[PDB]
């Protein structure tokens, strides 16, 4: 059994990574320039785009790539580090609003996680929560089109 999303961890932080098109992508504000661990020693990032808060390593063992969305839908679903699924209506290129706002804590540690269209295909990487007084109502995400061009 292989997973598309890996729960990754730094000394100071913990967050998600998502494998798409054979690359393990996650947020720069979590990974920095770090190598990813492997049973043969550290592996250096394949891509680094600080402009877009995006980095990628080669996809690790135990992983399986997501397919990029191509149906344009606006009904998204964010998957959290707890495997919770959260419906998110899309507003713009990198913005989406939670159909049911949640405490900020509920999304904590999930940046790097996937935003799925109705077909389970990747629309973007969860970048950051948009909060009013501890209540997340929307999210920013790195559109998967950015991933595809960054390659």
């Amino acid at each position: 059994v292989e997973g598309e999303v890996q729960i990754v961890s730094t000394a100071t932080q913990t967050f998600l990574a998502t494998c798409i098109n054979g690359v393990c992508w996650t947020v720069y504000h979590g990974a920095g320039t770090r190598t990813i661990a492997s049973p043969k020693g550290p592996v250096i990032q394949m891509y680094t785009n600080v402009d877009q808060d995006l980095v990628g390593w080669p996809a690790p063992q135990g992983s399986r790539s997501l397919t990029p969305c191509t149906c344009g839908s606006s009904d998204l679903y964010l998957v959290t580090r707890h495997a919770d699924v959260i419906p998110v209506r899309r507003r713009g290129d990198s913005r989406g609003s939670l159909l049911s706002p949640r405490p900020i804590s509920y999304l904590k540690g999930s940046s790097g996680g996937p935003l799925l269209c109705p077909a389970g295909h990747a629309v973007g990487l969860f970048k950051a929560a948009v909060c009013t007084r501890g209540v997340a109502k929307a999210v920013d995400f790195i559109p998967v089109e950015n991933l595809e061009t960054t390659m």
Binding site: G3, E4, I7, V8, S9, T26, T35, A37, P42, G62
Partner: peptide, 16 residues
């Protein structure tokens, strides 16, 4: 320090 993988999520729920 390296980013380490501490768990995996399978989107389809596929059992081992």
């Amino acid at each position: 320090g390296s980013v380490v993988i501490v768990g995996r999520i399978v989107l389809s729920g596929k059992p081992a």
